[PDB]
Write a protein that binds this DNA or RNA. Structure first.
Ligand code: GDP
Ligand code: MG
Ligand code: MG
Ligand code: MG
Ligand code: MG
Ligand code: MG
Ligand code: MG
Ligand code: MG
Ligand code: MG
Ligand code: MG
Ligand code: MG
Ligand code: MG
Ligand code: MG
Ligand code: MG
Ligand code: MG
Ligand code: MG
Ligand code: MG
Ligand code: MG
Lengths: 122, 401, 161, 96, 136
RNA sequence: AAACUCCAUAUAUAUAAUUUUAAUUAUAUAUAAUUUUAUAUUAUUUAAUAUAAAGAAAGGAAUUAAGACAAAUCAUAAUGAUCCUUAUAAUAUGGGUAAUAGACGUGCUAUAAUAAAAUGAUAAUAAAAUUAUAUAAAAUAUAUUUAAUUAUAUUUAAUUAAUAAUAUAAAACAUUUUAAUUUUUAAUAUAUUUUUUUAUUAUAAAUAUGAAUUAUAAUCUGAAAUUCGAUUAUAUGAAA
């Protein structure tokens, strides 16, 4: 299980020939942006194991890019079980780190998190 | 502030219409023939010259494809996808297909292959690429009195011209007429001299009939006559095809308005009605081997109609006319349309495509140099969503990420 | 007790020599970010890659590499940065540029030169401009030359030397 | 909607008959929404509190034995007395 | 019949009673069952074959329950009539149910059964001291 | 001050007969870091940089001392002094707080193609929060010949709530269109660019931008919409 922003991705990674199914449908159908797909691939790409592992991802919450990132994160963790010696390498690549970047709340006086309303000296 | 040479169009238009296929490597590839598929079963194949000529006229090669990448438009033969479809076409008694699949899977390409096959096997082809033109209201129309439907005599003329040119004249002029035909003349010459043009039964030909040039109000009559002639003749097979048939299915009512301000129905038009008649068991062609091959487009809208027509969903009666038109379904059921799902690419097929692209010199330097080939292929397969050809092509060429 | 299997060990060994693959071409990513405006990165990416495709079509050789070369050519290696200079004459100094800054300068010029081209779609305009630069024609080059000349004046205004 | 309209209407009428709910096929303003609205008056009335609450007056009634002292009242009385003393008392009220 | 009671409070929802039945569990013939379902309309869900209805019209809970019961009985009587009123040719309106489904989310998808690898699963590792211990 | 605190994070345990299910969750209780270790390179046993291996380990909120500004508040409320007590206290009906020369802040909408509009039902993808002084689903009717959309009416299914409703999130992405633009159209031919090409003919500073201002008709809330409210339609289409 991986997470990012509001997204949560439970991912079943298995040893069969490398095909993808995100949330009960084809990968290109779910993630339209190629960037998201590339990100998802990256844990399998740092290893030479894209094509080796079948991946069945199941996402919930957040938006598409965040969902894709959560899936990627989950996949790295799943891969770590298949061969523990690659764990360090995955960590170095920056896939085993849970991306903490959390949406800052709207503070009272400010308009958004940081965006304050205009100041007036005179 | 524009020159002839400079590119003024938007991107997709530019890629279609500015000939950047000019600066491309010549490739001595094998030729597409159904009789010798055993030789070139899973290989890229350039079309024959005659096929190309026919195919362009028909309107098979389309704008949003990456046909600009090569000298001429190119496909590969596929055992699971194209070859199987061809076999079905050959074998089946009804010979009546609708090419279904996900967006970018290669339905058009399948249609183009089917057209090419028909050309090879001495068949006439009536292709209607993009029914949007006749369905959406962007050309003149008129309510004919004899035929109780709205004719469209700009589109019709174009379609007639395409029919004339796509097909070879020897095959087309082998057909003698069943009836005599009077038409209004509309030449620059013999306007005052010949007020009418007359085609006789045995003496005249289908080619001659096609070459007739009338006023707009007789154009629909001419079209009707031609269709009838083609239905009657048993000497040559007639391949009818309609690509982006999804639009037709969904757009039940056209943008045209009758005398009272309300939208005209697709079946109240000439073209759409004719098309529907061809689809169904109604305008039955005399010859065998005479097929209708329809094709969906992921571009267009999706709704309950097409699934209901096929063996997919039970008929919900309460869904709206907008999301389910039952007349169209009924028509589809009447003419036994067996659907054909285009399968996504296998790993081997993908690899073969990638190899071809490399030969043609489309691959980027980061893909080729300093990378294992099998690994690259696997990555490409992954990024396409396990072998969506268009998506794969996009990842290969239009990525730059 | 860890117990690593033989096949796993072999796989690890095979991996060890291979370096970790980069997730982005950095210069391209930077360019896409600069193009982008309202967190609408996807649109910027589409624009850029479409332009690169067009460039490739016009001149059949790696588009990214060609773009990088163009950037290298165009990017002025230093800039005559102005200073207050302790409340006196504003004595300008040549200052060396970071890679991004170098390529940022180039990109703005490229964009400007594209904006003079005809089409409605910016992506097309951009692609045409990139092809022209690859072939070897722009006012951007002239501007760079001028900058270099201005840097050459003020030789020893550099402080540490 | 291939299923006929009249039959559907009949079905709807039957359903309405079965349950208590009314059947208005024409779609005329009946006035149903005026009466059917739950009346909110008691809750509105109960806003400020329970008027019968124990007061200091009662703390003499309940417990006469205990000589209680209301402090605020006593203070007020002292203030009044002070005002009277220094010529700042209230003027005598007109009757007419 | 589900009843609700707020213990310390005097909520006005304590009067609410909810009857709920599976329609196949009701003693009906097939024609009558369909008619009953048609009559129910929005109250009958079709995915789960369940018909429920709640009444808050009356002061007390018991009253409301009685009213609900009476309604149910009336519905049953209507279903079992069949005299000049079958409702054989009015299909089941399932629009409310599809709207409800749309409002909610779905997790219908499952792991492909042919993707499974029982051979790759971790086999039972031999623990000798545990085996020795197990003398029972 | 820092720290303990809250939110968020990672892990563990517990509980949930996996129909109130979202277990990819929720919530109690812990543990976790103001991270650690080592090799080197500069400056003097340590401290900054770099490299490496170990880790999920990276933020936000609350808290803003003493004094000062006779800073703000007697219109949250209370109290001192002072003034009013048939009036400066109390109730009703209407009007005003919304007046308009110029001026000053904050915003909103704009001035079109790296940007606007149509469309997109096996309904692409969220979170947080509200619903007994209620939330109002489906469906029918009218605006509107199909229907959808949007707006009202008709009438209340369900739920006072991890159960039903508010509510199919929207950008995204895709096709189509887009004046300025003879950078297009349509009549002919033309053809291996055919949702298109070429040839020759005719196509002659605010728009198919913007939405101020106004006219009429309807609808909504309320007992009541004139001063003075909110929608929808048909027109109006400033400035920029
Ligand atoms: N089957 C097949 N398809 C190809 C080949 N080469 C390219 N294609 C792709 O096929 C696509 C056509 O798919 P289509 O189903 O018409 O897309 P749709 O119009 O969205 O339905 C194009 O986008 C091409 O990129 C090929 O050799 N075989
Ligand atoms: Mg298509
Ligand atoms: Mg569950
Ligand atoms: Mg503190
Ligand atoms: Mg202080
Ligand atoms: Mg003060
Ligand atoms: Mg003061
Ligand atoms: Mg006072
Ligand atoms: Mg005051
Ligand atoms: Mg007071
Ligand atoms: Mg008074
Ligand atoms: Mg005011
Ligand atoms: Mg605009
Ligand atoms: Mg949507
Ligand atoms: Mg509704
Ligand atoms: Mg709910
Ligand atoms: Mg406008
Ligand atoms: Mg003006």
């Amino acid at each position: 299980v991986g997470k990012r922003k509001s997204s949560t991705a439970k991912v079943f990674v298995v040893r069969g020939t490398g095909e993808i199914l995100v949330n009960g449908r084809q990968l290109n159908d779910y993630f339209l942006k190629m960037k998201d797909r590339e990100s998802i691939m990256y844990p399998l790409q740092v290893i030479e194991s894209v094509g080796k592992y079948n991946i069945f991802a199941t996402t919930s919450g957040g938006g598409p890019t965040g969902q894709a990132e959560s899936i990627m994160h989950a996949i790295a963790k799943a891969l770590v079980v298949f061969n523990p010696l690659l764990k360090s390498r995955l960590h170095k690549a920056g896939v085993l780190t849970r991306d903490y970047r959390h949406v800052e709340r709207k503070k009272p006086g400010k308009k958004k998190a940081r965006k304050m309303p205009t100041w007036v000296k005179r | 502030r524009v020159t002839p040479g400079s590119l003024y169009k938007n991107w997709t238009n530019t890629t279609h219409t500015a000939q950047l296929q000019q600066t491309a490597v010549p490739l001595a590839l094998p030729i597409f023939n159904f009789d010798d598929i055993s030789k070139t079963l899973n290989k890229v194949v350039s079309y024959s010259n005659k096929q190309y000529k026919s195919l362009h006229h028909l309107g098979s090669f389309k704008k949003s494809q990456f046909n600009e990448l090569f000298q001429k438009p190119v496909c590969l033969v596929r055992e699971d996808a194209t070859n199987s479809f061809l076999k079905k076409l050959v074998s089946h008694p009804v010979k009546k297909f609708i090419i279904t699949g996900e967006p970018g899977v290669g339905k058009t390409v399948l249609l183009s292959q089917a057209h090419a096959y028909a050309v090879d096997s001495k068949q006439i082809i009536i292709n209607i690429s993009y029914p949007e033109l006749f369905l959406n209201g962007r050309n003149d129309f008129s309510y004919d009195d004899d035929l109780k439907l709205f004719i469209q005599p700009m589109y019709l003329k174009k379609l007639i011209r395409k029919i004339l040119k796509a097909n070879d004249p020897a095959l087309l002029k082998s057909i003698e007429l069943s009836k005599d035909y009077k038409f209004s003349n509309a030449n620059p010459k013999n306007a005052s001299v010949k007020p009418f043009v007359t085609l006789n039964k045995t003496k005249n030909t289908v080619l001659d009939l096609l070459s007739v040039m009338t006023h707009p109000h007789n154009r629909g009559k001419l079209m009707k006559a031609i269709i009838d002639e083609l239905s009657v003749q048993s000497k040559v097979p007639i391949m009818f095809t309609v690509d982006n048939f999804s639009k037709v299915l969904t757009t039940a009512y056209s943008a045209y308005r009758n005398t009272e301000n309300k939208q005209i129905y697709s079946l109240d038009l000439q073209m759409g009605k004719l098309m529907m008649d061809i689809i169904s068991g109604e305008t039955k062609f005399a010859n065998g081997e005479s097929s209708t091959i329809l094709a969906i487009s992921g571009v267009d809208r999706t709704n309950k109609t097409l699934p209901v027509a096929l063996g997919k969903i039970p008929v919900d009666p309460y869904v709206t006319r907008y999301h389910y038109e039952p007349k169209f379904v009924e028509l589809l059921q009447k003419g036994n349309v067996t659907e054909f799902e285009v399968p996504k690419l296998n790993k081997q097929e993908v690899n073969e495509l990638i190899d071809y692209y490399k030969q043609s010199n489309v691959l980027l330097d980061k893909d080729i140099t300093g990378k294992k080939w099998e690994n690259l292929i696997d990555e490409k397969y992954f990024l396409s969503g396990n072998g969506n050809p268009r998506e794969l092509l996009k990842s290969l060429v239009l990525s730059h990420r | 007790k860890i117990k690593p299997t033989a096949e796993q060990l072999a796989q690890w060994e095979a991996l060890k020599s291979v370096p970790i693959p980069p997730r982005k071409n950095a210069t391209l990513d930077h360019i896409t970010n600069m193009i982008m405006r309202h967190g609408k990165k996807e649109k910027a990416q589409t624009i850029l890659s479409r332009a690169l495709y067009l460039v490739y079509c016009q001149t059949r050789q790696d588009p990214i590499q060609a773009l990088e070369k163009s950037l290298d050519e165009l990017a002025p290696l230093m800039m005559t940065k102005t200073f207050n200079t302790g409340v006196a004459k504003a004595s300008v100094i040549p200052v060396p540029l970071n890679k991004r800054q170098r390529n940022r300068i180039a990109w703005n010029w490229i964009v400007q030169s594209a904006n003079q081209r005809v089409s409605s779609d910016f992506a097309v305009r951009l692609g045409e401009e990139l092809t022209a630069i690859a072939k070897g024609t722009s006012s951007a080059f002239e501007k760079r030359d001028q900058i270099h000349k201005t840097a050459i004046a003020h030789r020893a205004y550099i402080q540490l030397k | 909607m291939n299923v006929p309209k009249a039959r559907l209407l009949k079905v709807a009428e039957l359903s309405a008959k079965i349950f208590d709910q009314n059947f208005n096929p024409s779609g005329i303003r009946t006035g149903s929404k005026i009466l059917n609205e739950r009346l909110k008056g008691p809750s509105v009335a109960s806003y400020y509190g329970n008027p019968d609450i124990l007061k200091f007056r009662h703390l003499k009634t309940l417990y006469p034995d205990i000589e209680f002292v209301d402090l605020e009242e006593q203070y007020r009385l002292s203030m009044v007395e002070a005002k009277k003393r220094r010529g700042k008392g209230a003027p005598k009220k007109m009757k007419k | 019949y589900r009843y609700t009671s707020y213990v310390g409070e005097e909520h006005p929802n304590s009067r609410k009673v909810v009857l709920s039945v599976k329609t196949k569990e009701l003693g009906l013939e097939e024609k009558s069952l369909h008619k009953f379902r048609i009559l129910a309309r929005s109250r009958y869900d079709h995915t789960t074959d369940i018909f429920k209805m709640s009444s808050d019209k009356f002061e007390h809970a018991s009253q409301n329950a009685r009213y609900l019961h009476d309604i149910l009985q009336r519905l049953l009587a209507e279903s079992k009539d069949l005299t000049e009123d079958d409702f054989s040719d009015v299909p089941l309106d399932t629009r409310h149910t599809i709207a409800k489904s749309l409002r909610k989310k779905k997790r219908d998808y499952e792991f492909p059964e042919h993707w499974k690898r029982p051979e790759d699963a971790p086999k039972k590792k031999f623990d000798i001291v545990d085996q020795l211990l197990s003398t029972l």
